[PDB]
Amino acid sequence: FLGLTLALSKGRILEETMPLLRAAGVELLEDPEASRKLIFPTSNPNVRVLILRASDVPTYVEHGAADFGVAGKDVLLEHGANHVYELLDLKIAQCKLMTAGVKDAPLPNRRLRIATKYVNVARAYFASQGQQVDVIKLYGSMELAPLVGLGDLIVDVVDTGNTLRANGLEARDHICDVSSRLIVNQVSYKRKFALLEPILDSFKNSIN
Amino acid sequence: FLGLTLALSKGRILEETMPLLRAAGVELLEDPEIFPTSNPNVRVLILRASDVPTYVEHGAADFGVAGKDVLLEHGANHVYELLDLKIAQCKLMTAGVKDAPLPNRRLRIATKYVNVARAYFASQGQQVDVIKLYGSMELAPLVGLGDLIVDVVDTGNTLRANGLEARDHICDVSSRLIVNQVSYKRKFALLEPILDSFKNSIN
Amino acid sequence: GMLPDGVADVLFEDAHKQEVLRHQLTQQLITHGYQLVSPPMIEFTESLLSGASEDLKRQTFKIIDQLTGRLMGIRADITPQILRIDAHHGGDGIARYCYAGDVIHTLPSGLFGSRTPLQLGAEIFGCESIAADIELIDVLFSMINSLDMSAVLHVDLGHVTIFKRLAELAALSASDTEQLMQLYANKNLPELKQVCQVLPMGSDFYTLARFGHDIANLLGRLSENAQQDTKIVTAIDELQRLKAHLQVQWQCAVSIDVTELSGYHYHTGIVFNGYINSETQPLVRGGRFDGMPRQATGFSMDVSRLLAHTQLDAPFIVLIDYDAFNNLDSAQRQLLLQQVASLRQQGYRVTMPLTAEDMPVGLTHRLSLADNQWRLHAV
């Protein structure tokens, strides 16, 4: 295969990206949600799509298995985006990375225990606040961690704050703003710019 | 809360564990798809399988059920593996594209099971480059991210349906009962009745 | 900025406490006849790791001596340095040593464990008698008791000789030993009972795991081949002597675990592990290490682990009033400095201020001039 491989996260990212793609001349030929397929052809026979877990998109793109992808700044910050180009803020799937603790419970006086997916983001943030923390890596749902005293706080993605409040947690500190970004393999940007430029302009046009 | 907190993985592990629990006097009071049980001493956490060792080793859970696959990958130094439950049986294997030949470079392995991968290829005297994947691995060989994958295999149907085939058998996988070191010393009186009912249920 | 995992500043009152503990405990050991030695942080690997387990070699950071090109290490353990020192200075008779020093580990031992413990310890060289093992317990408990801690030390007694004799007598393979040590370490009683039913003297290996704690009756539960072994009977007798001594002399709750093979693998007999409250990582590790032969037994503890369980009297932090002092004649100033010198000798922390705003941290008292007189005044 000689054209562009686009890495997409399933769920929120996928649904909000289809309009940008359609405008760039790239329609998927069926609905992924009801398919046992992970490589999808499109109406542009140069472009094909991979449906991945959001955390694997930077991996596939940096190694060139995908030429470009859409992933949240949250996944990019955690993973480290040194080996890819973040060309475009797409301003889709907007949320924030925040610390969160039990509702009305105060910070204890001991060494803070943080439970999170976003281990590197956590270390970075608490470093910048001059705070030394013990970090516990969680792959799954983090809202449980403070309630059984695994961690004092969690670092997680927050939109309305409804998921926190419904589990007896509340947002404390704002770490940074999160939006899905267009990332490109460094080599793919140099070698396949002719194939990319039309789609990057159509994405640039769709946003502004 | 003064009693036992049981960490359970959702999916295959959960469905196969309910019978062992029922026999130990622990029924969940609703379908998960923090939970109280019919024994008011025991409560249950429904976690991602990979987080069970974490919750147990830190004492947020007193004991849990996780596959030998997750325990081998995580490292089970800080917990006690008390029981092979002989449920959710499968195997960790290497897998590649059907009939595709080994390249001449260092093999590139794409897998969740990064440490298991390094361990296995070490034991076969082979040096590998490993790429960490959190999601579905069957795609990795097909777009040439890795040469092989390390994944859990039951029938082998998921591999064959994606144009892959099992190569090497790494080890056998079964769900195990793990216990927090402190919980085993301090709450043995609450544990022993449930451990015996689990020991009894495997006959 | 941020520090590496398992590396922490000890600051302010914690630093003062650590300094007092290091000093009190070192002086105690010196008064019990232990010779203080202060070996360096770095040696050549030839001497530092001479007869070391792969675990001690892996815990030792390596560096290159730019004078010779040869490999050196940052010590992860002082005991091997005491061995080197004893070899040169100790002679053939009994010799006692104590030490306190920083050691560095490449990896932490426990969940969020320290990589920079302040290792403090004692070694007795040149005595075979269990009496030397009893003297060390006496010295250790003398030290623990002097700290007036709220927390209580649980002692776990083990003996590596017991399992090693059973392994030799039952002629276990290299791998069968590994499978039993793994099952012991995870207290897998069911899967052990299965493995043990097919092993020679297999019932003895199951007995260790099920009935090892009951040391009074352990001998009467072992096979005739095992019961006849002098090294096993000695081992079980040493545990009973120490267990008794610890309960009678020191009112210590002792638990026996003859499946404990977890310390530094240079251990050759009796092993002791002191746990503080319900903490997973032991405060104190000790046991026999006859093997450079020279007889040797000792213990080490991380002084830093005592911090959370020891208290000092709140300190007196005194600030001399700036304005009042500068209003004094020369003779009046000299008179104050004599009074300040008296306070410092008594352990008062007195700041002679540089400015009106010069404020010591956690101020308790002001030294103030009221009716031509200098007195302490709580704030």
Add this chain to the structure above:
Amino acid sequence: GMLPDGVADVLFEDAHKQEVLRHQLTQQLITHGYQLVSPPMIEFTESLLSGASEDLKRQTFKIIDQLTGRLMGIRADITPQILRIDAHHGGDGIARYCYAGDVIHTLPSGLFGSRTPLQLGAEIFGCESIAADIELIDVLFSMINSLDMSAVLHVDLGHVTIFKRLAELAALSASDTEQLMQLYANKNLPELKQVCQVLPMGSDFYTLARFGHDIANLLGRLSENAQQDTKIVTAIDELQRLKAHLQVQWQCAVSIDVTELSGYHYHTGIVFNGYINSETQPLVRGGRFDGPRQATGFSMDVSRLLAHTQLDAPFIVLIDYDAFNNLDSAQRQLLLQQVASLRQQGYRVTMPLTAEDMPVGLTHRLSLADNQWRLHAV
């Protein structure tokens, strides 16, 4: 069991002495209002060497953190760690710190130097006044005097501000600075006179080396451009103030050298070097340094005091083996109480394991005569 050059055991009575000195001196500093801090032996290089000279970077052993893959260092100097600590905890006001800890150097500093000094020191942060520099001298000499040493401390005063102002005003190149610092360090007056005849304000740079010692008249020997520089006039005035304070208050022989730039290059002003007797390596090194925060302090190798300090002979007691083993339980308990009393008084008492069990340097036996335990000189 050979050791690396510049690495030595401190053994037995020397180890006891070192432990007493470390503790006496730490307690003195604490009672003078200095906060004891004990920072770790290892940090990431990012924090440990943050704004460090090539000399400090070269003296720091590097090691690999296997958790992150990042570089760490074994500290060669604690002062940078006090700076990090002060930055977080110190605030904007005055803050005092003291420390005692092992540091490791890759290379020895001078002729047969240690690579493992026990660095003990004090820092004052947040005061511009020469008063802070005067307090530290007073604290240091308070400490030196408490040791009741026979040996005497010669103090060498320098000031890096003087050369640094001349370097800025004469607009020196990177390499010309290096050639002058090399020549200054061996006080090569002939080869300096040659180099200085071609340099701008070159006569001023030669004046530093030839007439730096005579601080009373140094200003009147400098070029008009130099003499009008406020930072140079302040610098030379600070040396005169400290020289006077040291002679008047402390009866200390002071020598000036305004070309001493051999200390750690984080120094930004006054520098102090304390030499014990005629020893090549200074015992004490101190000076001004900077974060936008004022800082001054000193450090000393406690190990260098050992050969010049003495303690009271220790009392080393051996309980008679045969007599003790002849005792009933109640009689044994009675002895242990008496032995506990002796240890509390600082007696070194060995409860023997065998008849041959002999403590090193035995002074006294605790012996049983007529149902009574008494000390007996051997």
Add this chain to the structure above:
Amino acid sequence: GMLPDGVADVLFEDAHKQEVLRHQLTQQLITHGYQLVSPPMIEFTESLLSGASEDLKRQTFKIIDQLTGRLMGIRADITPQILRIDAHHGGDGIARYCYAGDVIHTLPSGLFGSRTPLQLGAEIFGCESIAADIELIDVLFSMINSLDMSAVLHVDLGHVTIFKRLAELAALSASDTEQLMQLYANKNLPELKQVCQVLPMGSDFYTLARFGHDIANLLGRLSENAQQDTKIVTAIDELQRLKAHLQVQWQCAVSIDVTELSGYHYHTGIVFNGYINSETQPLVRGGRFDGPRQATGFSMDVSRLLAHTQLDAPFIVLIDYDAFNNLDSAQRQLLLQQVASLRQQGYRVTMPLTAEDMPVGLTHRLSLADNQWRLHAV
């Protein structure tokens, strides 16, 4: 017997291939008038790292010369050694050099990179003209084309002069430069747009990252202060000249990136990166350097060619054991002459020690039939 990450044996046919490639390519460069030099693996750091960035210093393993006590390094790069050699032997005129040698890196450069590349390269010293940069491209593509590879080389052109002139004209701080070089290296366009709105000439620094690829129109997008700078206008003109030469002469797809500063920071002008297929780490790195002498050159890891080059299957011959041992002296001599003839023609002939002595990948037997020795495919 596991090896360190980024260290691999090159074995058997791969080793033969590597040896052929090393030799073919070295002879090509020699016939193009490049002088072969073979400098040592180790020098003193004074010479090996003379005017080196932190990146080159960090990639160089350090070792101790036990004769002098001085620091040496295992070379991570040969180019600085060519510079030393040229300084002594080269004179003021034009000089050409080629080299092939092992170099060692402390860390791998990219995802699963080698730490032991076989570095092969050419340098032209003493010519300012872009003509020297064009000769090297011609020599390199002459070499690449001779390999008859299926894989294709994508060339990336950069120019460090452009950013360095903008840094000087905008009078950027030491730290601001670092933050821009970090952002450029991940082409973080959003976070760069934010940083650039507060920097002097900030729009020019954003223009480099967003519109650097479009070199035809880049000049017309820069600030008037920037557009007036001769060194920037020359730089952008040099890129256009090379881009044109590569497309016209060589039918080469060129991409421009004027923010490429990831090569060794001794580069002073034009930079070239050759990528093979879609591989992350470039095969070829080249550019201008000046450590008062003009210099330009390139280097490549010969080992990276292995997976993309093929040799004719080799002829591996085994002499029949039993037949040979049945021969008289004169008959044996006659065979050895025939075997010598086969080896001269490049046949791999094994004279067997036993009946079981079997060469790996046997293709032919040399067998005796009717008093005659002939080859027989197995």
Add this chain to the structure above:
Amino acid sequence: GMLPDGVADVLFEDAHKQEVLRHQLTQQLITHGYQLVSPPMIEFTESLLSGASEDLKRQTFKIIDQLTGRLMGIRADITPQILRIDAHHGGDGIARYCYAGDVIHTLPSGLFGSRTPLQLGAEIFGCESIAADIELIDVLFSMINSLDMSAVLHVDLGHVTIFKRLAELAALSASDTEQLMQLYANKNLPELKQVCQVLPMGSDFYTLARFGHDIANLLGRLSENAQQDTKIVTAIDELQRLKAHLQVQWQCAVSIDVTELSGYHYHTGIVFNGYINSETQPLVRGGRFDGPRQATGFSMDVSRLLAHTQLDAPFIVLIDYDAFNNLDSAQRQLLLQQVASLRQQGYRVTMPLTAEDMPVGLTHRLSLADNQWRLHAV
């Protein structure tokens, strides 16, 4: 600047020569059925120094792998790497390996010796027969003869088995062995005769030193217990077979020394040392060792051949600058085809950048005379 003692540039024609020698000799070994392997410069010490003498450990520079924190070494010898490779790939049958690579020594071996030899060698694994030792001599002398050297290789044969069997049979102490090896090494015949009169079978140890050279008669001079010992009779028979083979097949002057224990102490049987003219350090070192797996091989420093090998003077050609620039496109293409033809024939042709562009050691100009391009000696 200056280079470390025992470290030298190989420049220009010496570099060309070294490159040709490395390649010719590697191809020869490959055609004799030896598998080329190219193992890395650095491994973990665990594998690199696995079963090594203290001499090989001390010749190996140590470095820290920053990925793992573990110790690595720059190889001082490739043979141990062939052993590792053979262990994995070789199997139980016979296996042949050849190699050429740089190795680094911490100290020079002889007065002003190299610390950076280009080690080239062959190993046979899995054959007990002296036949394998004879094949290696055949391969070596095939290589030496192909070099057309003026200098002559003197071969010294030893056999460590002989002395080791005498040491075992005479039941010598640890220290008595040391005193005999010291006396042998300094050919102290008088002080040996004294020591030997008190040792059991002492006359046999004296016989080795006095009559070891005369291998034809050595067996008939030894004690009855020695003369019957199978391992001694085999050893002396192996020396006679090799001595004969070297003189008859290869016209090589052989000297025997059964008291030679010089070379890497991993040697376990026959040993060969090739000396070039009257040079103190041997060019070639070889003999038996153990992978249990049988092993024999040799190594040589290719760089030691340079001073004794000559190549045909090279043709260094400069195309006339002015004439070339006067050509149309079709005329330029026509020249480049002619230039390509010359380079294929090994001519060194420089396409000039300027009128002054002069290749080093110019022999010929390619000049245009009467619409034709011809070579012209200068």
